[PDB]
Structure 1
Amino acid sequence: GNFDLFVVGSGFFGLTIAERAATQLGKRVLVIERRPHIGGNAYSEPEPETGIEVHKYGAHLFHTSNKRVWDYVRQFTDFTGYQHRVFAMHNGQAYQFPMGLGLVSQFFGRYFSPDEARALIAEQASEIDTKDAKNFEEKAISLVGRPLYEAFIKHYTAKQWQTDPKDLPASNITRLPVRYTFDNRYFNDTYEGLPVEGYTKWLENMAADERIEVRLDTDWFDVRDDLRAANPDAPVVYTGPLDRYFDYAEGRLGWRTLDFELEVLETGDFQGTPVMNYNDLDVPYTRIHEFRHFHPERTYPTDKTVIMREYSRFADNDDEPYYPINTEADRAVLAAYRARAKAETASAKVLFGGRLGTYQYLDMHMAIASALSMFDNVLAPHLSEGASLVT
């Protein structure tokens, strides 16, 4: 049939756009998705042996301080009262985390009060002067001191960035706070929780409107010419890779990827907490997720659990792209593609959005906020009142 709007990609950005067009302007929307499932990287699914919901592209924790977004998402799902907390494994011991009075007292072997901890860190971090810092390693030492740096930062950084911290620029550290309280709540956003029926149901609700069609297993580039010949005045919101859209004509944007190993174990509980960071070099993974703990309210089985080991890697051409590397070279490459994108927008009615469309890491709430904004300020005016898509 006929379409008023094409959305490429069914992640949170894509589905926010598609939903808002359908329900707020009455528009016919086609969502083209190349994967065999919707939801982009927020997709979740039960592990078969155990029934436990697993986040297939990495652990997804929802948090936001944006009231508008919080009100928007709650139309599609309820949230549990989950609060994220993380522990760290170093030299055979499990530490409270992030760095705070708990970790400090554990690591140094006795209670440090807020004033005493402040004094300790100050003294140890004085080894290097921050403005003299030549690189990441030195800057981190100049902020938290060498003992804490070498125990909980050095090797974890090396694993996560796949680069020796001495070869990372000092530039990539703004602050490196130690909490001078025992508060170990990981995020400090106003709103936080996990979707009660899980992420996939949430995303399916966003696509529920009759005026939205979702075509899975479909690559936009395989179908666009005849789809747009069908509906020439239909604008496009594209949330796939930016460099691919222009046939890599400016070069490939660099990304980091993640490898996961899912394992079902014959115990009811492997580590007693959702996420354990592994700070030492003697194991190759950065973190282990245990998914039963994301939803304690669920009646999961008692004799099995599923865990997931996470590993960091530079992305090869065909790896899933997760984090932009963002070298100067990358930023110059990006610069060229957004010029192309602005010209494609003006000439072909194609908007570029989302994590892949803009070469940006985006949290779920930031992707949603981004899409709501594109809708309100660029796309809806066009669809409703013929306004230009040129900014």
Structure 2
Amino acid sequence: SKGFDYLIVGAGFAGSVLAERLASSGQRVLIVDRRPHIGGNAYDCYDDAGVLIHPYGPHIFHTNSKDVFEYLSRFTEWRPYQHRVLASVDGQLLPIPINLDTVNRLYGLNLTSFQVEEFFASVAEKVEQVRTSEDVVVSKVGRDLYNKFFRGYTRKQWGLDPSELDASVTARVPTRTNRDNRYFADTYQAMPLHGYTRMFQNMLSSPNIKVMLNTDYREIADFIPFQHMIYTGPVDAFFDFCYGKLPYRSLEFRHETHDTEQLLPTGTVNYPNDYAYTRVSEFKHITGQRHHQTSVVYEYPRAEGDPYYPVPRPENAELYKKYEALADAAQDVTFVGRLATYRYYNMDQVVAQALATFRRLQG
């Protein structure tokens, strides 16, 4: 071989799906990551005690797309799992998303599904145009439930009030009149049976894929031959922050192991109103691993650190537009992924995006 058809930057879902697709169509692919491991944020591994964990926070796979689910199925088997989260509020562990039981338990009511609908209507606030993260919630369940479940959590997570964020943020967590307590109502809910990393290895295993780790693309870009680049990192950095830093929100993770089989009643407990952390997660709930000990992770929001979240709001959408135009003009570069196109995407969404990009590149 004398070079590569593609240099792919980042070995998370965005990069790896494209690597898999290009390589299976005959292309020579070099995939690179500044991190010492593949998988990006979805990387998993065994900790010191032998528990399978997610070093970058709990990643629960879920999708409504049959195509996405069947695509991933090529690379892993599944453990069925429907994630459930409780919120700590007024000293109780209550379902989030808010549902019938959340409301009845919180206030000691005995409303039926039909009645809880009118109760919501009786407390809701009228908003002419729903635009912010405050609007979406307050206009649906009213001020008190907003205060109890969203305001505090949102401020802690983003360093911003919900009125300061686009509606699309808090609207991720739909409110319900029914008694569904799953965090997701997606059609397909399941975890890679032996974890994500195993899945990524299968994904990246073709002979046409060379993997370079612990490596910034800029370190090798001058002297490795390649026709096209797929970039999945932060956009602002790609253009040397020429228009200023595009805000991304970060996280610090405090992992702990405990000498019992179970610490929590569910996979994740949220803390809208207490503590420095937004939530704790316990991995055995998610992986189904059996073990005599247990490992959990506490997440603390951070203004600095590796970028994990775009911050959806008008001034950032605007700043992003500028970077987007440089991106659109970059000739032999395709931008794809949560960080690179500045979209608050779920794993399955990134997969679909990568798949659609491959089709265009081909197709």
* TM-score, with structure 2 as normaliser: 0.93
5 Å-filtered alignment, 1:111-260, equals 111-125=110-124, 128-131=125-128, 137=134, 140-165=137-162, 178-228=175-225, 231=226, 234-260=227-253
Q: Does 1:380 align with 2:359?
A: no
SS at match of 1:358: coil
Q: Does 1:310 align with 2:299?
A: yes
Structure 1 CA distance, aligned partners of 2:175 and 2:232?
A: 37
Identity, % of aligned positions: 40
| 2:97 corresponds to | 98
* TM-score, with structure 1 as normaliser: 0.86
Is the Cα–Cα contact under 8 Å of residues 271 and 290 in structure 1 kept in the other structure? Answer: yes
| 1:364 corresponds to | 347
Distance 1:218 1:109, change over 3 A: same
| 2:6 corresponds to | 5
Structure 1 CA distance, aligned partners of 2:316 and 2:163?
A: 21
Question: Displacement of 1:375 after TM fit?
Answer: 0.8
Is the Cα–Cα contact under 8 Å of residues 258 and 313 in structure 1 kept in the other structure? Answer: yes
Q: Does 1:333 align with 2:319?
A: yes
Deviations for 1:189-231, whole angstroms, at most 9, x for unmatched residues? 1111000010100011100111111010111011101113xx4
Query: Please, which moves more after superposition, 335-344 or 305-314?
Result: 335-344
SS at match of 1:111: coil
Which has the larger helix fraction? 1
| 1:385 corresponds to | none
Q: 1:274 aligns with which of 267, 270, 284?
A: 267
Structure 1 CA distance, aligned partners of 2:90 and 2:318?
A: 42
Is the Cα–Cα contact under 8 Å of residues 140 and 176 in structure 1 kept in the other structure? Answer: no
Unaligned 5+ segments in structure 1 are 382-391
Structure 1 CA distance, aligned partners of 2:330 and 2:77?
A: 39
Is the Cα–Cα contact under 8 Å of residues 3 and 28 in structure 1 kept in the other structure? Answer: yes
5 Å-filtered alignment, 1:15-30, equals 15-23=16-24, 25-30=25-30
Is the Cα–Cα contact under 8 Å of residues 139 and 173 in structure 1 kept in the other structure? Answer: yes
* 1:148 counterpart letter in structure 2: L
Distance 1:337 1:366, change over 3 A: same
Is the Cα–Cα contact under 8 Å of residues 284 and 290 in structure 2 kept in the other structure? Answer: no
Distance 1:247 1:291, change over 3 A: same
Structure 2 CA distance, aligned partners of 1:190 and 1:5?
A: 34
Structure 2 CA distance, aligned partners of 1:242 and 1:170?
A: 23
| 1:299 corresponds to | 290
* 1:249 counterpart letter in structure 2: C
Distance 1:143 1:202, change over 3 A: same
SS at match of 2:78: coil
* 2:61 counterpart letter in structure 1: F
| 1:42 corresponds to | 42
SS at match of 2:186: coil
Question: Displacement of 1:299 after TM fit?
Answer: 2.3
Deviations for 1:302-339, whole angstroms, at most 9, x for unmatched residues? xx21111112222x3xx111111134332333222222
